Amino acid sequence: MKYFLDSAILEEIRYAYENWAIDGVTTNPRHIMNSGKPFLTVLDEFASEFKGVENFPISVEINPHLDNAKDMVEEGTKIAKLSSNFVIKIPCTEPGLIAAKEFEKQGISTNVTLVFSPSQALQPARIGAKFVSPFVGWKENSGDDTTYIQDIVNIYKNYNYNTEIIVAALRNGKQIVDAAKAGAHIVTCGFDVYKESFQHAFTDYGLNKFRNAWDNTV
Amino acid sequence: MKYFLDSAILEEIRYAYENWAIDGVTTNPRHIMNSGKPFLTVLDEFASEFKGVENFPISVEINPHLDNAKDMVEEGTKIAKLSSNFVIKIPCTEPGLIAAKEFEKQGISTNVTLVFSPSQALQPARIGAKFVSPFVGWKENSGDDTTYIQDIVNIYKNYNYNTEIIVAALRNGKQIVDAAKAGAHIVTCGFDVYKESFQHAFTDYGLNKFRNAWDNTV
Amino acid sequence: MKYFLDSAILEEIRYAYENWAIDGVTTNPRHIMNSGKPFLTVLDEFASEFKGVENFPISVEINPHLDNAKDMVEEGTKIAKLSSNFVIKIPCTEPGLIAAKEFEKQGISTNVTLVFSPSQALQPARIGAKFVSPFVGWKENSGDDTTYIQDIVNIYKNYNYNTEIIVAALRNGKQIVDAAKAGAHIVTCGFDVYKESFQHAFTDYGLNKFRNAWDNTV
Amino acid sequence: MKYFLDSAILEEIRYAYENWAIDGVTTNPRHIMNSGKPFLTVLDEFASEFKGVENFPISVEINPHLDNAKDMVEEGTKIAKLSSNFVIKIPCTEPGLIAAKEFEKQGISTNVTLVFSPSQALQPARIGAKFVSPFVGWKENSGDDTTYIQDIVNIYKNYNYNTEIIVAALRNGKQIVDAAKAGAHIVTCGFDVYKESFQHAFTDYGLNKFRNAWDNTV
């Protein structure tokens, strides 16, 4: 399973890469907004930080106001020319799946994002998208279940698709264990979701019992 | 999974082929009727539109009044001589499965249509039909379930049959996700069923949140 | 099970009431639009057609542009004063569930519509809404499953709620059989969905066999 | 469970009533055809045979060529006036469910027959039909499963319907055990299906072992 840091903060991207062995980084217009830095700045920093690093995908969403596939291809071609690690993130919309097919034909890796059904996930796979990001957290906040994730994993496998599934909007380590149990390729999560997922109360209860024993021993 | 456009309109066949990457086109006497054009005209246009295109099957149903396998073989041989992309569609009837066996022996690809049970689907497979079209929508309109589709997929697989299953009469993207979850080879659907299957409300709710963030960012 | 005609056409409402024993009528801004008649006209006709008829609920949606619960209560109080059979249909929105609670406190029957999750269905029940309309067809068109309907039925039953569930956006008789198998109180469907649900090919195949026998008999 | 003899032969109806305790008799235009006697004759014999017998329903199908509910009501009123044991059998068709509602309103018991889906079974229940006959054998002969029978039983029970389900077209005692396991009220079967259902090879193997023991005993 790959662990992609869903963050636009380079202090958290640097830490997770050196200590948690993250395999990539995903960003959205909301994360770059919370960065405080301007978009092009965040990109320049990400391009230099991982200049040589190979096999480190950095998903970067194009202008969300774009409505024409041709305007999404001109904007994503420019962003993709800034670093070989950059993967253009395109919304699962009529003009975003037409633009993702043209991009993939020109050899520009694309991450069809905002997919909330297995029918919206199959077309990105039929056009050779490098990544497809099915969202979980958003649907749950509205009281909807998310075992459409297993369907996408099973469909992708049954039809031998190379598109890698990035379960997104993950909020806890139990949802990371649900994606892993399904067979999802990658899971994108914030720095704190990953930190807490590596911590249990019984590990602290157990370490106190072992610390008491060590002390009562020569 | 293959996406065959269930349409006889060449404006929708041209669009779906260039933007959605459809893998084929299926037609029935009802779709050619709604075309407005005469049958032979629709065929001439389809033959020229995809003259060179290879691996683009165009299922064309013969006279539905035909009742003798010999009259169905003389009519389907003529239609098949109009284009190498044409696949003769024959009803699953005593004289339609005798005519589909003779056709397949002469090397004319056949699509045994109007199959509504796994027992009606097995004979088309025992005679080497190129395609078998199990219908879903019709049975549902009368209050009948359609998990006989999984049976056909499982039987075809267990006995290593080459016949490709084309789930037909699909009306929504959830039925396209049911066919994909079963392992069906192809799904034939109208242009609008495919368009809506690529669209979700949460993609629009998500694009508004990302459009607000992009705006509140330098 | 109750059969509510999802139509604003009084030729279809009159027929279904006299021949199919419909138990009510649901309408939305889209059905009144397709009526061709102006809204207030459709209402006057519905009010006179069922002037005396008791226990015949006629769900009528208020202005969809309304955004304040107070503006939705002033508009729905006026519509409700036009007939005792009228049930104000309100969208499941913050200001639509505040307006549905005030309406129900004043004794005006309300039908909280556009519910697409069991969490959105529970609040309408916690405020004493007369009806809650969970939509099926829309979610399916986008490739989403709808067994959240059983959850709502089970929750409503477990907590002894009086709110009656009206499964909406039904498109076939198999979806009417799914709602009945779940235990939904009412199912709202168009005139043609109900007509086809009462017809099977095997009834026609069987009637031909019985018509041949009757003829070969004195 | 009730055992209704699906026969128009009075030698088999007389035997089954005196030895098997049949609870009723169902007939169709095909069984009266195989009787050899003319229809009105079969009816006169059935009317006299069970003149006084109470609680012995005798389902009799009206002219299968009838297409108007008014012509089906004039024909079934005449047949019903021939004996108080006669139950008018009407096909599940638009004009047959309109005629079954008028009949039930006039107090004439009706058996809505040729039902092959749970959606076609629910309307007969919504109009107060005395009996609804879901067919099994016919659908199976075409390779279709029949666990729509459990759905009808469950729906009827969930909504407290009084209509009694008569599983029809039964061909073996295992299908009688399937109907009983579902909770069907009545099962209609031919004389030979009932005879064989009461016989097992292990009963004969066991009776030979007990006959040998009896002989080797004083």
Place this chain on the structure above:
Amino acid sequence: MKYFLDSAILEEIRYAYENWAIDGVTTNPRHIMNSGKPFLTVLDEFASEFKGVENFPISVEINPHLDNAKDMVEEGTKIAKLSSNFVIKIPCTEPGLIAAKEFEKQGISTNVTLVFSPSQALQPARIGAKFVSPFVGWKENSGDDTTYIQDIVNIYKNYNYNTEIIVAALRNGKQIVDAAKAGAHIVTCGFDVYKESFQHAFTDYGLNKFRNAWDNTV
């Protein structure tokens, strides 16, 4: 659950009644054969042993060569006149279910035996048999499973039948636990099957551990 001793030996019937609280006794032509005593003798002893005992059913099979219901009714009426505890055991055969219906109409308790299917068990219930004995051991010896027992229990319960099910041919206490888990009313077993069913190795292993402790204690 009732425990009926499947034996014709009065040393085992006397012991099981005073120590195991057996609720009845079932016999077959094979058990009376192994008794060594002549049939009428075994009956006289059983009649005197339980002369006053009430609610102690003693199932006694009539001549297994009998083939006419009238000859089975004359033979079973004589046997039934020998003791009020005697229950005539009749094979599940055409002439044995006709004879069991006449017997039950005259108030003579009957135990329709040699039933090996749930279809053969339903008719005995439709005629008011006091007991129905579904056999298990015989079918298993030939490699057949026996979860038709649960079907009979469920059918009997669903249709509120008073007939009590006596699971017969039981050979081990696990088959007694299978009948109890199903809900069977009575289980008939040989003396040794009951003795071993009350004994476990872990009870002896446990009693040795408790005997060692008792000894190492004042």
Place this chain on the structure above:
Amino acid sequence: MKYFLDSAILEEIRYAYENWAIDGVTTNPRHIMNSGKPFLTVLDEFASEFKGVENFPISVEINPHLDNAKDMVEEGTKIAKLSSNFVIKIPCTEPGLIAAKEFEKQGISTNVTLVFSPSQALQPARIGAKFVSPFVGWKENSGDDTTYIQDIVNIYKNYNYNTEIIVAALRNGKQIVDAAKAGAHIVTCGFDVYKESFQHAFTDYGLNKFRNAWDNTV
């Protein structure tokens, strides 16, 4: 899946071979009886009809009165010398499984028939029988289920047995779909069971809709 015609009539064997592509023919003493022709005559006709045809097994049962394995081997050796397509059918009896082992050792193909349990099916496999015929229809007529067929298929597969399973006594196309869903190698059925299995009412309802469209089209 192989389709073996369970018939001794050469008009039906000739038709099914030329139009349905039957893969073999099974016969029993009852089918040769209904042929009207004497046994040796039926055999001579079958031997000439398929003189050269290879891979066309013709199962022929030996004298059913035979009780010694040596008398069954002398009778089946003679029948097998009449044609290379003939497969000696032997009953699953002590002397029939001893005779089937000797036959298979001499290279005479055998079809161990009348198998009604998975324990009776395993021995035929342990002796290298070419075919094992588990019967379904007979057990069902007595109210018994038949999912012992899946057990035999699973056992045969788990232990890599070459014996081919011929599900016999099939009466409908749903039982042919049950055998195919299990993984049975061959299914033997009468000519009419195969004809009806290839026909559905919805194919006729669909062909009428397509015939109306063709007519309303130039």
Place this chain on the structure above:
Amino acid sequence: MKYFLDSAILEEIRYAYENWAIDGVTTNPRHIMNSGKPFLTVLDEFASEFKGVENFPISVEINPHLDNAKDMVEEGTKIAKLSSNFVIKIPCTEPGLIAAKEFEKQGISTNVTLVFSPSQALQPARIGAKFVSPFVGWKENSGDDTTYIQDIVNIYKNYNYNTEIIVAALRNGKQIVDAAKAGAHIVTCGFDVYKESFQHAFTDYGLNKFRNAWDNTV
């Protein structure tokens, strides 16, 4: 659910009764051995400690060497005369179930212990034992599962038995949660099994987070 302390130490019986609200106390020859006190002494202390306490059962096992039901009845009558809270514990053995039936007939409450199967549990219920103790821990130590406990609970319930089930040999709180999920009446456990069952690491992790907050608050 009742919580019976499986202990013969009165410091732990006194604590659990005043702080955990134990509903009873079970003892075995092994627990009295580990008490250090002589048996009769432990009994005198238990008799005085709960002299007046009503509804506080104190299970006390008789001499484990006893082999005759008459010697077990003379020993258990004496022990039962020492306190009205004492319940004679008898092993599930031929002579222990004969002695438990005589005891229950004289009105002396009995706890048939060392039961390791649902067949050994049913007889104690057929003789009116006050308690039946199915052991879990012992069987598990040898690698055996224990979902025979649910069978006993279900059987007891299906046949309306008053005998109360005391799941014994419990070693952890997950086994206490398994007995409660099954529906067992009582669970007997050692003092430490109960203490740890009331403690979780996440309660300590949570109390540290709440202790930090309380401190950073006025």
Place this chain on the structure above:
Amino acid sequence: MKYFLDSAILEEIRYAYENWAIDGVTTNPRHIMNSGKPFLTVLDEFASEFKGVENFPISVEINPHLDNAKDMVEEGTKIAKLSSNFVIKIPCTEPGLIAAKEFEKQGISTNVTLVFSPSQALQPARIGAKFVSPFVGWKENSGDDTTYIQDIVNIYKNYNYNTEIIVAALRNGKQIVDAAKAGAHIVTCGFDVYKESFQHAFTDYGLNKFRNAWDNTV
């Protein structure tokens, strides 16, 4: 599946080897006791009967009183030197699994018997025992289920163990079908369990129908 005759009688071992193709023979101190012949005699006969026969394992249990692994190795080495077909049967006890490890290291095939849990079966596999005999009948006689057999088969398979599982204490052909459905390698049964497993009542009912037809045929 292998069929090992659980017998010490050479008339039954000779018959089963020549007619049923048994693949081996298992014996226990109880079967040699019932032989009537002295142990060493039974061994001499078995050694000569199968002197040359290869791949015919003959399991022979050593002195059951042995308590030291060294005394079990000296006794089993002597027995193993009497024939190359002999496989030393050792009980699953601390000193029997230490002796089975030493035996297997010296190349003496061992059959660790009296295994009644999957935990007792895993150690025999961890030491390279040639055979492990999990007992079924004994546990069932005490009311215990035996689906620990599937666990052993699954564990053995998951960890690629070569030890062959011999399901023992089998009493009917349904238990032979349970072992085969699990995937057990061998099943050991008495001569009569195997004979009855090859016989069904429906084979005799079917042979009577075929004998009547043969007679009514020229």
Place this chain on the structure above:
Amino acid sequence: MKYFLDSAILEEIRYAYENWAIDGVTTNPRHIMNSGKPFLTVLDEFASEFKGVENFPISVEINPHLDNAKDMVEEGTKIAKLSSNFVIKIPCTEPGLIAAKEFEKQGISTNVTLVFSPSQALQPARIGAKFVSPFVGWKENSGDDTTYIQDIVNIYKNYNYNTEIIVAALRNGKQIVDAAKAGAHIVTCGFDVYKESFQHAFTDYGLNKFRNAWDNTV
């Protein structure tokens, strides 16, 4: 399956290695405390006892008070230099998974212990830990289930991880059978848990029956 002795006592490690074929030894600060010997002494003895033994992993936990990954790497490098059989055991904590990644990069085998969730188990696998020890007993003592073990096994397998799972805190042989049924690589248990797992009461009951037979035999 590997059997690792969870003990720091060399009398039990020596016995289990020579008689039970243990494949390794795991220790924790609590086991070294109960050893009585000082830590460095236990290590020197373990280093000499298995000086040459290859493939015998000896898991040794570092100072439990360590809180910095750099202090855990300096302490575990020293311990690892004492023997090539030693595997540094590190707690699943932020600084323990950073230290386990550095250790594994330097070629020092690590056993990430105190893992109580499948999310805490995945990171140890993403950093190439040699072993991951998921604890069972502790969670159960607090009333928590442990089928997160199957999740870890399935995740490890789905993503082809080489990390070997050591199910720890095992207290009975049924928990050893649960780990084996899941597919866990190793199970660590105390000497007594392993001894009892190899013993069953039915083996002693069976050995008494075989000892009685041997005696009644020449």
